[PDB]
Curated annotation (Swiss-Prot), chains A, B:
PROSITE patterns in the cross-refs: TIM_2
Oligomeric and partner information: Homodimer.
Entry's family note: Belongs to the triosephosphate isomerase family.
Cellular-component GO terms for this entry: cytosol
Cross-referenced Pfam families: TIM
Binding sites annotated in the UniProt record for substrate: K16
Identification of the protein by name: Putative triosephosphate isomerase
EC number(s) stated in the UniProt entry for this protein: 5.3.1.1
Subcellular location per the Swiss-Prot or TrEMBL entry: Cytoplasm
Keywords attached to this entry: Cytoplasm, Gluconeogenesis, Glycolysis, Isomerase
């Protein structure tokens, strides 16, 4: 085990660039708070939460998790992610974050190729792949965001064919760059939508098929999440959970009670 | 005073993406250590050091500075910088760092437009300008890296004319975007060199002239540093200090004794 094993269900909270430091510290302390009933021992092996703060609060986030773990004797209660990293270990790359340093701060997962980075900064498939490779070199699980870049046509087979093939071009360089035994998580979100479960189910089913065709027998496990902004009710009553191994929570999740509500939803669906 | 006043001499240590977290914590604790004789009370009003760590260690760096300040009763002993920031306050910008959050962590200065970011990521003059504006909105001093993008010709007046005019295109959008009363620091390094003091002196003199021509009477103060990798002896005996208001220290500065040696050099030149 070079890598943490992946539970069947993954819930991800990415704070993007929305939170101030004090709000991030209060927030992660709310997640861990036992009276908040978000993190249950009985969920440990089936359901996992990741918090993905901005780079500045990874340190005190990591410190908060540790302090909470020291309350018990020796799955972590909560995974800590970063929202990006560089494609090299250490070096002369001003403004860039090292996966070496991330691992030293007990980050377990790195979000890569977000739609926002692809649109604003022109981040490419090759770059996301090299980034995944460097994250994996440090024992970090790549979490690669994928999705169709085009507005799709009105013929469904054409539309599903395009979307899946556009995801294929994003998946292939990542799997080529990664060791076959390193785990990877792909988060799907159709970039032109800014949640149709029929559409998600169909493209995700085409994604899993794509992966099986490239490397059916790789030892590293694979998970496909919904990367879109998911609201209360979508997972269970909306059927989203029948299609994917997890999801990103939308901005309702900025309130701890919202997160509590969605964990309950997820428990009920299992 | 919306901004810290700028001393006549600025020394900058940017760690780029070279240091692990424990090495950064040890390092800043070495800078502050009184037996290391790097930070002298007698230097306070004439010479200032900035440390510019990676985003992950800004928090414990800030914490270390505070803890040291609490050893005395209420110029900071050491400025804390970041190596980049985003051009907006808060929002949906995955992987980006907010100048709001930086200020909340007692960062006083933001390095922008580094040659490494301009080359690797295609970072543009417009983007560096918008970044400077957002840093200034939060009371942060922009530190904009500038320099000629071309290999220069063999006729000196042509070469100096080009280099200065290429710096002009980088300076102008920054001054346009900044309030006239916000301070700005420009760090010069000819991108094609990968230290000729004659060349630096000549282009820096053309830079100060350029600035005076754009906005002779702005209230915000301006400093021009050498952004190249400066080694021991270059400032005083090499004459660099007669041309610029400070410099970036080269990799020799990774050793605390190196920093000590260069502070002594600088003291002697004043
Ligand atoms: Na970045």
């Amino acid at each position: 085990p070079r890598f943490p094993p992946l539970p069947k269900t993954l819930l991800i909270i990415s704070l993007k660039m929305y939170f101030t430091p004090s709000r991030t510290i209060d927030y992660i302390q709310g997640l861990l708070e036992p009276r908040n009933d978000i993190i249950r021992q009985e969920n440990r092996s089936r359901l996992l939460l990741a918090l993905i703060p901005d780079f500045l609060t990874i340190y005190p986030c990591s410190e908060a998790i540790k302090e909470f773990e020291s309350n018990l004797a020796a799955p972590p209660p909560l995974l800590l992610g970063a929202q990006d990293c560089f494609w090299d270990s250490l070096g002369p790359y001003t403004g860039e974050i090292s996966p070496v340093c991330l691992r030293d701060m007990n980050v377990s997962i790195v979000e890569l190729g977000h739609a926002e980075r692809r649109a604003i900064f022109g981040e490419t498939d090759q770059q996301v792949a090299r980034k995944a490779a460097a994250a994996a070199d440090q024992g970090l699980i790549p979490l690669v965001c994928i999705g169709e870049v085009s507005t799709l046509g009105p013929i469904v087979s054409e539309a599903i064919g395009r979307a899946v093939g556009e995801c294929e071009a994003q998946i292939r360089p990542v799997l080529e760059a990664l060791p076959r035994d390193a785990p990877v998580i792909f988060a799907y979100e159709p970039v032109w939508a800014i949640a149709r479960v029929d559409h998600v189910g169909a493209v995700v089913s085409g994604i899993r098929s794509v992966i099986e065709r490239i490397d059916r027998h790789r030892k590293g496990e694979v998970r496909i999440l919904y990367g879109g902004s998911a609201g209360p009710g979508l997972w269970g009553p909306g059927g989203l959970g029948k299609e994917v191994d997890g999801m990103f929570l939308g901005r309702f999740a900025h309130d701890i009670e919202g997160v509590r509500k969605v964990v309950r939803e997820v428990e009920e669906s299992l």
